[PDB]
CSV table of C-alpha atoms and ligand atoms in Angstrom, one decimal:
chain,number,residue,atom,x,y,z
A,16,UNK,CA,53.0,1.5,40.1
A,17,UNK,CA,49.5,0.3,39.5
A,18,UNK,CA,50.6,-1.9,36.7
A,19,UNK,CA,51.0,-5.6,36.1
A,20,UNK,CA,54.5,-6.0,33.6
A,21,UNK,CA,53.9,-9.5,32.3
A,22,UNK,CA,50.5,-8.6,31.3
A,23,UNK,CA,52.5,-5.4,30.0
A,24,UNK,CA,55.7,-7.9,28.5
A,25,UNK,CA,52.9,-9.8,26.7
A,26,UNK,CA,51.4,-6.8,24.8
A,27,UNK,CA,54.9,-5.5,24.1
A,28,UNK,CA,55.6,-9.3,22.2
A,29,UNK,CA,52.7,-9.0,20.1
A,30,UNK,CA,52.8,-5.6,19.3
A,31,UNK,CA,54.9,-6.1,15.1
A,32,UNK,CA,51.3,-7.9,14.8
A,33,UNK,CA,49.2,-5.2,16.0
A,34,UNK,CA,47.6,-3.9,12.0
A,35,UNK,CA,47.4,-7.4,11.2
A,36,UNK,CA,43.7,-7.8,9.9
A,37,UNK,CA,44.2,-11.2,10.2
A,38,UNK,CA,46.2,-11.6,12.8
A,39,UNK,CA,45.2,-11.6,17.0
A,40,UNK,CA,44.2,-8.2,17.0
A,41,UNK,CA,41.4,-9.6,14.5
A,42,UNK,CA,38.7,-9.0,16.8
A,43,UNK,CA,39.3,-5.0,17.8
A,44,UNK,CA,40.0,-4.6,14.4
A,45,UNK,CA,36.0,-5.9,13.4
A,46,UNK,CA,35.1,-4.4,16.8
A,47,UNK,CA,36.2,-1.0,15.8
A,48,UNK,CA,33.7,0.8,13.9
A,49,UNK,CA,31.0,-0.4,16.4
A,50,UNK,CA,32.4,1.5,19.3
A,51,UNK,CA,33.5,4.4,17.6
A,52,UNK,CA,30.0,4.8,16.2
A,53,UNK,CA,28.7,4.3,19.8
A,54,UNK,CA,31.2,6.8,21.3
A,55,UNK,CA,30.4,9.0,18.4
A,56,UNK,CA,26.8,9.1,19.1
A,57,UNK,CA,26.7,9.2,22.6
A,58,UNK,CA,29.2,11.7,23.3
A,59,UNK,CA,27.8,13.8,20.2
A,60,UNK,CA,30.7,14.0,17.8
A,61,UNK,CA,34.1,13.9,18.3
A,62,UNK,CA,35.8,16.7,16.0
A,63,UNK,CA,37.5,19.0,17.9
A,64,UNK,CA,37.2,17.7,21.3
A,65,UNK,CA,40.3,16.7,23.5
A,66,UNK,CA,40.2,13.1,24.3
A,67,UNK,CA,41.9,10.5,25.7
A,68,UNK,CA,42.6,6.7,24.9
A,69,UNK,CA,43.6,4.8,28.3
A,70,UNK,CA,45.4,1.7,27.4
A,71,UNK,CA,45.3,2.8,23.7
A,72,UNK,CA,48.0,0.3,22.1
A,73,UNK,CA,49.3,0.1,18.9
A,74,UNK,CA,46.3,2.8,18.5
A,75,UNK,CA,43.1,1.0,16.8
A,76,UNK,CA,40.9,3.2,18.7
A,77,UNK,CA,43.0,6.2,18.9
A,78,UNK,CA,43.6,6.6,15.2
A,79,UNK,CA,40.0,6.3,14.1
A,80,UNK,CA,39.1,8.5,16.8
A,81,UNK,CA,41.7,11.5,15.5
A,82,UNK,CA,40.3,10.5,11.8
A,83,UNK,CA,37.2,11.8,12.9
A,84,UNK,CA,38.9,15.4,14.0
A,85,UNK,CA,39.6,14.7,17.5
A,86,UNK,CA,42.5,16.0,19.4
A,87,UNK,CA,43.5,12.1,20.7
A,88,UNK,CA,46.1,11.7,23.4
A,89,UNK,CA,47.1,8.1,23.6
A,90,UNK,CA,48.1,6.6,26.9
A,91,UNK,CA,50.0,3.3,27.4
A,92,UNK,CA,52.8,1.5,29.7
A,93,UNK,CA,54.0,-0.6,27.0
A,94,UNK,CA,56.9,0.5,25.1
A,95,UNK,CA,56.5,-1.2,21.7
A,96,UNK,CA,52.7,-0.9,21.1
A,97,UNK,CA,53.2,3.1,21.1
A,98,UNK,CA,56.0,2.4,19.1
A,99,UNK,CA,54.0,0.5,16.4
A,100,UNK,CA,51.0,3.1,17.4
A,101,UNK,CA,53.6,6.3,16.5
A,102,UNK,CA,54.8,4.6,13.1
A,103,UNK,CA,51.1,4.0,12.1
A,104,UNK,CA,49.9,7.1,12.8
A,105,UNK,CA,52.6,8.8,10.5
A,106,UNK,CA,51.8,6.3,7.8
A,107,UNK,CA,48.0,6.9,7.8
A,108,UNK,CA,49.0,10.7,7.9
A,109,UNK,CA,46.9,11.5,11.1
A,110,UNK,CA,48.4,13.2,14.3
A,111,UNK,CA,48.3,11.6,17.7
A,112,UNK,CA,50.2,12.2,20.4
A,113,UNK,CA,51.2,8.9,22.1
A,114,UNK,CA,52.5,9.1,25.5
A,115,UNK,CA,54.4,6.3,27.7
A,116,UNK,CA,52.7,6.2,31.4
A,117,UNK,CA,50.1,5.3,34.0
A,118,UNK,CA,46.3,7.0,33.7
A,119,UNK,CA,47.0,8.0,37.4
A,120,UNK,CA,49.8,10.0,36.6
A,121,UNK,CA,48.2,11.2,33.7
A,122,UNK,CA,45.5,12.3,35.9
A,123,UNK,CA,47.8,14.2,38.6
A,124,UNK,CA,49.1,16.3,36.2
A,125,UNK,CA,46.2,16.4,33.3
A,126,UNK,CA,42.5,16.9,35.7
A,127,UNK,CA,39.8,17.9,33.8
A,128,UNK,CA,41.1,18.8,30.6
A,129,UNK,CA,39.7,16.0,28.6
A,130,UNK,CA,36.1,16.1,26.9
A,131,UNK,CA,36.1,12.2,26.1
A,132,UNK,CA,38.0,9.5,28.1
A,133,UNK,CA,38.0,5.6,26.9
A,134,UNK,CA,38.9,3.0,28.3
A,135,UNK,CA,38.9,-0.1,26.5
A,136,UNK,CA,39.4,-4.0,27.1
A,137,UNK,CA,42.1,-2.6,29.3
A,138,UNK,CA,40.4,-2.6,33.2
A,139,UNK,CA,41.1,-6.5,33.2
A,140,UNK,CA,45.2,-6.3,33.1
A,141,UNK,CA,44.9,-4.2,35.8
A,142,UNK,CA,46.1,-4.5,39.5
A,143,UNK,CA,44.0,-2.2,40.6
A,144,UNK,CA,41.3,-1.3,38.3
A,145,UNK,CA,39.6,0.7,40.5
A,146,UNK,CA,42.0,3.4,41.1
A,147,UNK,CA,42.0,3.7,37.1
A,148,UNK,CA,37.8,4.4,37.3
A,149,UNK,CA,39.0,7.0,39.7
A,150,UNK,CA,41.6,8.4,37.5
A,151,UNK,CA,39.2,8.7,34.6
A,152,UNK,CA,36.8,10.7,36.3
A,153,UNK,CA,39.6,13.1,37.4
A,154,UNK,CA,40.9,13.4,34.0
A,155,UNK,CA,37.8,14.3,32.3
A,156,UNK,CA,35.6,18.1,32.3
A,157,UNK,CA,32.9,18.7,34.0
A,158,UNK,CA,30.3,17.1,32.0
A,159,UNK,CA,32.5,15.2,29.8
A,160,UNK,CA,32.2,11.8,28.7
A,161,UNK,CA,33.7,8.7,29.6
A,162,UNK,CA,33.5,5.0,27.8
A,163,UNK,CA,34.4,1.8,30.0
A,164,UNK,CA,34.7,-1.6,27.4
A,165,UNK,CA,35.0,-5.2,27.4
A,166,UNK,CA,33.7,-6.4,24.1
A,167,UNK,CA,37.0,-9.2,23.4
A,168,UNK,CA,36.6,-12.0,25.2
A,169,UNK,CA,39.3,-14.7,25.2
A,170,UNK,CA,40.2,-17.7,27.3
A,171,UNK,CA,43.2,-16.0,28.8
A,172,UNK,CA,41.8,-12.5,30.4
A,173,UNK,CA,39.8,-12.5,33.3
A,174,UNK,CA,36.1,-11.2,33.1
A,175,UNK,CA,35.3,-7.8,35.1
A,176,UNK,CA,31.6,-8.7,35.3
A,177,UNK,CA,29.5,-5.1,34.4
A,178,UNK,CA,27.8,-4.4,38.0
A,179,UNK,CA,31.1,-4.6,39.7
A,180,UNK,CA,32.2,-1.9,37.7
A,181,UNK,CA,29.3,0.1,37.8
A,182,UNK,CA,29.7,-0.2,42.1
A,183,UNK,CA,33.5,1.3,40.9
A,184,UNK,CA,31.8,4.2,39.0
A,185,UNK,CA,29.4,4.8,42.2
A,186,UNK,CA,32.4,6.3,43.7
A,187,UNK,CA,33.6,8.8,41.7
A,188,UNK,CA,31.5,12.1,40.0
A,189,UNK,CA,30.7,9.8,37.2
A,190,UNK,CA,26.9,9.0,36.8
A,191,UNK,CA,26.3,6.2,34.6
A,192,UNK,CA,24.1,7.0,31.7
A,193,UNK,CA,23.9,3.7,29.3
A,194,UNK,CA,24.8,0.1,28.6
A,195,UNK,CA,24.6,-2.1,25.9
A,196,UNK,CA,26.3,-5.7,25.1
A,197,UNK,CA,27.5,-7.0,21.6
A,198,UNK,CA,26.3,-9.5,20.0
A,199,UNK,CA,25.7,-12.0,16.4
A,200,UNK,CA,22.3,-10.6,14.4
A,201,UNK,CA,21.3,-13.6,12.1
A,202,UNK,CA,19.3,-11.4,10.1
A,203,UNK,CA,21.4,-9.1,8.9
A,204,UNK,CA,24.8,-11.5,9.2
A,205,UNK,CA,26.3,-8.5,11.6
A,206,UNK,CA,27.3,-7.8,14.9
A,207,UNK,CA,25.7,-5.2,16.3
A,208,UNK,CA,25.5,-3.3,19.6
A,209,UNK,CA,22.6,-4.1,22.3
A,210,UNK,CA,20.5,-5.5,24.7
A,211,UNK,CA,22.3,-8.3,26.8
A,212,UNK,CA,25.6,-7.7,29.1
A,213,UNK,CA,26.1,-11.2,30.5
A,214,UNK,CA,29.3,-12.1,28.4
A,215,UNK,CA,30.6,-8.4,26.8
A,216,UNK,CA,29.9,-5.1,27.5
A,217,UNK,CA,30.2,-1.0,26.5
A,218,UNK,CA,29.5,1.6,29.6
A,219,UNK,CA,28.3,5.6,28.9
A,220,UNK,CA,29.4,7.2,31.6
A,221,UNK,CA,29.3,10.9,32.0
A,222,UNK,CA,30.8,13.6,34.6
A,223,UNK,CA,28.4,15.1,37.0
B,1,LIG,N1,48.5,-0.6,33.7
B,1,LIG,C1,48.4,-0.1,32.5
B,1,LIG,N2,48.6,1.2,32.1
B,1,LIG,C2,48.5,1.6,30.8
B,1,LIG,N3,48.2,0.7,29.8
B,1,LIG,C3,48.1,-0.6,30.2
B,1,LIG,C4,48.2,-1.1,31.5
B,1,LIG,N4,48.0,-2.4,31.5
B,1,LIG,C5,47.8,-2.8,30.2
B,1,LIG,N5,47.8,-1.7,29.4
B,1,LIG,C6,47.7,-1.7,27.9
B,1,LIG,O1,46.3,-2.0,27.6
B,1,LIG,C7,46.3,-2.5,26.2
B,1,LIG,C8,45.2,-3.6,26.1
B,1,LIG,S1,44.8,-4.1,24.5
B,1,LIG,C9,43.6,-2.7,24.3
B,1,LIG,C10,44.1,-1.7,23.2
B,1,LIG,C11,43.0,-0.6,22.9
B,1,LIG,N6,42.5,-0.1,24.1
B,1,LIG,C12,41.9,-1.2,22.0
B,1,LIG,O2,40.9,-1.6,22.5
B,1,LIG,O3,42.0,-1.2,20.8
B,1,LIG,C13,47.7,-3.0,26.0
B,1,LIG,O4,48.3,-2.3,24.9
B,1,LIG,C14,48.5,-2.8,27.3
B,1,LIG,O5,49.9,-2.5,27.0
């Protein structure tokens, strides 16, 4: 119910595209490796850990998260992104389980199992994107971790500006622990995560 399906239908039309280096998914693709090493370090490792990929896709995040030895249930309303998301998986020979429905189901039926919860570029196609910060802080342990990311920028999504979701987070047993923008480094040619959330942002958030 809390989902938007042409936001949905336009995922599910771009999904054959979805391992394309080259093609739109360019960005997450480069993006990658910079928020896995953030979720990495923040939520000190991942092997072994049950976690959880809200909105996961075709499974960018997911994939290189179960690389890594994590237990990695991926969660999506679109039909053909899990579909490209289950294929790739097998390919790559990594296991992920790739499921087909909202986080606040999820949530009814999976509280506090998870040790990591993330939840990338994926708040801004929602109706209701509160109820989803809600949801994530049900699904995951006491203590547990949970990301919240907008590091894509295009002209389209709308922008969920950082302290609005941070007054989101307020409300639930999440307690917000770091946050941290990405942006160009001239020196070293790179992007790199830090200082600066006015256009993109990556939230720590962990369960109280
Ligand atoms: N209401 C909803 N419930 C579950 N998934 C949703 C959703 N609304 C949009 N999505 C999914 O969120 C994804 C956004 S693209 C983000 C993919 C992945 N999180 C990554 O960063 O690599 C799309 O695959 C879309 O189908």
């Amino acid at each position: 119910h809390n989902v938007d399906h042409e936001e949905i239908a336009k995922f599910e039309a771009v999904a054959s595209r979805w391992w394309d280096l080259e093609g739109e998914f360019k960005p997450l693709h480069r993006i990658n490796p910079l928020r896995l090493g953030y979720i990495a370090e923040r939520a000190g490792g991942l092997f072994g850990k049950k976690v959880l990929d809200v909105g996961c896709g075709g499974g960018i995040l997911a994939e290189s998260m179960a690389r890594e030895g994590a237990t990695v249930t991926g969660l999506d309303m679109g039909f053909e992104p899990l579909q490209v998301a289950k294929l790739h998986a097998l390919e790559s020979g990594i296991q992920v389980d790739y499921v087909q429905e909202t986080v606040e189901e999820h949530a009814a039926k999976h509280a506090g199992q998870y040790d990591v919860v993330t939840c990338m570029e994926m708040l801004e196609h929602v109706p209701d994107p509160q109820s989803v910060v809600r949801a994530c802080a049900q699904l995951v342990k006491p203590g547990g971790d949970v990301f919240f990311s907008t590091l894509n920028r295009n002209g389209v999504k709308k922008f969920i500006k950082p302290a609005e979701l941070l007054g989101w987070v307020d409300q639930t047993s999440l307690k917000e622990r770091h946050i941290t923008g990405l942006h160009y480094n001239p020196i070293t040619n790179t992007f790199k995560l830090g200082p600066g959330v006015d256009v993109n942002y990556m939230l720590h958030t962990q369960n109280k």
